[PDB]
């Protein structure tokens, strides 16, 4: 079917490269390390989503004046003024930022939050991108053994 649709559009022939994985057994030793647990990986991603949602509600309830990703000045947008928007911002930027979320928000120099927000970012870093990606990688390393 995909080979037939490739005539209507000469780009569905890219889906035929999936045959090197779902077809011949030359890649089983590599893909088996990922397909072995599977359930553990989706459960890990779900737990990560839950933890990021927890951090999102905490930030929405206690950190308003920090998410101010304005460009060129006086353009406050992409803030935490919406729960879904803040959750998407977290799950899309803070996870992939490589240094937690404390590097993509304003500087935590304000009173009443100087230490609370520092604890916030450092716990996000240590719980999301340190011990929740180490789990994802350990699930791949243990499958080989």
């Amino acid at each position: 079917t995909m080979s037939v649709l490739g005539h209507y559009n000469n780009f569905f022939f890219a889906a035929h490269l999936l045959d090197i994985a779902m077809g011949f057994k030359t890649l089983r030793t590599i893909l088996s390390s990922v397909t072995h647990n599977g359930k553990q990986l989706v459960l890990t991603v779900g737990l990560l989503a839950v933890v990021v949602y927890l951090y999102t509600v905490v930030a929405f309830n206690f950190f308003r004046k920090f998410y101010n990703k304005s460009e060129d000045g006086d353009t406050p947008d992409m803030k935490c003024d919406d729960m879904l928007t803040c959750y998407m911002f977290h799950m899309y930027v803070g996870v992939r930022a490589g240094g937690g979320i404390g590097d993509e928000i304003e500087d935590p120099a304000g009173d009443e939050y100087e230490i609370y927000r520092i604890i916030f970012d450092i716990t996000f870093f240590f719980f999301v991108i340190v011990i929740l990606l180490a789990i994802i990688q350990g699930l791949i390393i243990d499958a080989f053994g």
Binding site: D111, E112, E114, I115
Partner: peptide, 20 residues
């Protein structure tokens, strides 16, 4: 005002050990 006083309040509890 809690960025500086937190460590002082944490260390103020060990005076009961310093007296002993």
């Amino acid at each position: 005002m809690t960025v500086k006083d937190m460590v002082l309040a944490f260390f103020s509890s060990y005076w009961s050990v310093f007296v002993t």
